[PDB]
Amino acid sequence: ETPPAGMQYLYGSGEASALSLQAYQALLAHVAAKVKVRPADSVILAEGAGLDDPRFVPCGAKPLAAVFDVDETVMLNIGYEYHAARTGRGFDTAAWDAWERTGEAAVAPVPGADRMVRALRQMGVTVVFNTNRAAGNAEPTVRAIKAAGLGDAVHGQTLFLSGDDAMGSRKDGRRATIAARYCVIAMGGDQLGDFSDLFNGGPSVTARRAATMQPAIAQMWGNGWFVLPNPVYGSGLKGGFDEVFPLDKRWAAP
Amino acid sequence: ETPPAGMQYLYGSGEASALSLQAYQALLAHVAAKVKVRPADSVILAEGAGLDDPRFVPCGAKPLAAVFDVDETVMLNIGYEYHAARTGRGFDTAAWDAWERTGEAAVAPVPGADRMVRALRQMGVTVVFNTNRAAGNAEPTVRAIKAAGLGDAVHGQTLFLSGDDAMGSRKDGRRATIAARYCVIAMGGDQLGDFSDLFNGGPSVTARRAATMQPAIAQMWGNGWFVLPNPVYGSGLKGGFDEVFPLDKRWAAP
Numbered sequence: 483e484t485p486p487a488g489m490q491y492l493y494g495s496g497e498a499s500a501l502s503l504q505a506y507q508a509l510l511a512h513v514a515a516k517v518k519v520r521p522a523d524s525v526i527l528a529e530g531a532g533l534d535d536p537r538f539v540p541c542g543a544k545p546l547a548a549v550f551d552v553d554e555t556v557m558l559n560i561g562y563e564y565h566a567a568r569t570g571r572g573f574d575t576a577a578w579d580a581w582e583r584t585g586e587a588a589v590a591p592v593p594g595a596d597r598m599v600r601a602l603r604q605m606g607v608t609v610v611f612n613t614n615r616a617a618g619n620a621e622p623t624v625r626a627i628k629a630a631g632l633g634d635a636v637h638g639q640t641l642f643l644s645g646d647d648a649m650g651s652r653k654d655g656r657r658a659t660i661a662a663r664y665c666v667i668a669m670g671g672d673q674l675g676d677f678s679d680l681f682n683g684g685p686s687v688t689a690r691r692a693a694t695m696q697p698a699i700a701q702m703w704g705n706g707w708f709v710l711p712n713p714v715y716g717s718g719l720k721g722g723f724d725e726v727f728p729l730d731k732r733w734a735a736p
Numbered sequence: 737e738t739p740p741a742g743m744q745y746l747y748g749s750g751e752a753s754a755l756s757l758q759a760y761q762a763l764l765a766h767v768a769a770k771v772k773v774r775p776a777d778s779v780i781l782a783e784g785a786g787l788d789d790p791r792f793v794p795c796g797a798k799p800l801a802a803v804f805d806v807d808e809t810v811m812l813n814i815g816y817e818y819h820a821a822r823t824g825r826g827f828d829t830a831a832w833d834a835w836e837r838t839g840e841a842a843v844a845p846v847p848g849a850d851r852m853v854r855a856l857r858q859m860g861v862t863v864v865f866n867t868n869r870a871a872g873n874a875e876p877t878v879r880a881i882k883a884a885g886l887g888d889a890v891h892g893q894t895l896f897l898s899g900d901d902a903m904g905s906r907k908d909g910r911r912a913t914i915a916a917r918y919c920v921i922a923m924g925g926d927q928l929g930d931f932s933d934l935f936n937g938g939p940s941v942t943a944r945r946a947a948t949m950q951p952a953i954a955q956m957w958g959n960g961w962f963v964l965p966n967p968v969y970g971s972g973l974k975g976g977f978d979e980v981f982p983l984d985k986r987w988a989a990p
């Protein structure tokens with residue numbers, strides 16, 4: 483009779499709201515500093531850079547911008563996750579497609595996303611969305627973004643979707659398009675693929691966690707790359723016992 | 737054969753490590769500014785202040801300090817949560833007591849906690865732990881803190897535990913003791929009771945979430961009060977369907 487713990491946490495708890503507000507406060511402070519003192523590097527990795535040796539698209543004289551993942555980064559998909567909890571069928575690509583098409587009035591903003599987006603625009607920073615919602619559902623997604631109070635997104639200018647190129651769920655191509663036009667000074671997401679495709683398509687659960695602590699990646703967290711919680715679905719909900727609970731740290735009760 | 741999703745997320749995922757590193761980066765930047773420009777208010781609520789109208793213990797000329805919850809804020813209780821996942825018996829106060837006594841070699845630091853604590857001490861900020869581990873298990877808890885790389889804690893100076901007063905799991909009394917001696921300029925936690933007992937002992941799930949968005953509270957997140965994720969146990973894992981999925985945001989698949 484109770485929803486899954488991850489959904490209780492993410493959608494129900496004050497803990498999760500405080501955590502999200504924290505991310506957006508750190509992001510606004512970071513953008514503010516960069517608006518006063520424009521950086522040499524943008525926050526989007528250069529083509530061909532690896533997690534071994536991160537290099538970035540330079541900032542240049544391009545217009546300042548912030549890039550956001552949509553789902554569980556600025557918008558909470560309450561309707562869909564209600565359905566998943568009611569039915570137990572969270573993995574259902576056809577129902578997800580229906581949801582992309584008809585869910586625009588069952589979303590809520592992530593706590594602080596509305597204030598955060600308004601502030602970015604008042605600082606002269608363009609807000610750009612890069613989501614793996616499908617291109618053919620661009621218009622319902624625009625209306626869902628507007629309904630969540632996040633403003634007016636425009637396909638191919640400030641909204642980039644899966645299928646806008648032939649890389650599928652890989653977002654690096656769209657990041658490159660975006661970084662070719664703007665100086666992206668902050669990027670927000672709830673999954674590591676919202677920052678680099680290099681975290682996915684191969685690396686194990688333990689490899690990906692280690693990669694976030696690589697020094698040139700680790701410096702980005704809360705300082706260019708901003709993270710929102712998602713213990714409900716996606717690339718964080720993987721791994722067996724040996725990858726979640728490493729064996730030097732195990733213990734048995736008496 | 738797979739652990740609970742919240743544990744996959746928190747202990748296994750790079751998503752969760754990046755999120756924690758973000759919290760500690762924002763905290764170090766905030767402490768740094770406060771070390772240059774000492775504030776008038778500390779970060780600990782004054783006695784008698786309400787969530788309606790937050791007021792704070794002044795900073796004065798007291799020594800600078802940062803206060804941390806221990807469990808799932810600076811230290812990951814991997815051994816205990818392995819046991820909980822293996823057995824299904826997460827709520828077991830006797831096994832938790834055993835764990836307090838014998839788990840010191842089955843803990844890991846939260847990503848970034850070791851670097852963060854070292855930096856605070858190099859900046860001249862005293863690191864103070866306020867945990868609801870029990871007073872009578874102070875010494876194993878000191879050794880677990882040291883094992884996690886978090887340095888040397890001292891009962892009644894830099895380590896405060898449940899039972900140090902007669903308020904039980906209520907931490908406001910110990911916060912007051914701490915704020916009477918230090919200018920606490922940052923406080924970290926994974927549950928709202930790590931910031932104020934006023935979030936607990938009454939308020940419903942939806943009330944507590946709303947309270948984090950009260951303006952004078954909302955300004956603290958990532959800016960004095962720093963949050964770490966815990967979708968595994970505690971006050972974030974509460975509420976029925978109506979409190980997790982509000983009814984204006986519900987949706988049915990076709």
Ligand SMILES: Nc1ncnc2c1ncn2[C@@H]1O[C@H](CO)[C@@H](O)[C@H]1O
Pocket residue numbers: 562563566572573574575578714715716
């Ligand atoms: N609870 C969930 N479980 C699985 N996939 C989910 C869930 N919520 C949303 N999704 C999304 O639904 C699609 C597959 O069901 C993917 O895009 C995935 O990200």
Ligand SMILES: Nc1ncnc2c1ncn2[C@@H]1O[C@H](CO)[C@@H](O)[C@H]1O
Pocket residue numbers: 816817820826827828829832968969970
């Ligand atoms: N998975 C868990 N479920 C319930 N309580 C837990 C869990 N992990 C740790 N605890 C702690 O164990 C004690 C009760 O089992 C409480 O202090 C609670 O915070």
Ligand SMILES: [Mg+2]
Pocket residue numbers: 551552553554555671672673
């Ligand atoms: Mg997302």
Ligand SMILES: [Mg+2]
Pocket residue numbers: 805806807808809925926927
């Ligand atoms: Mg804790």
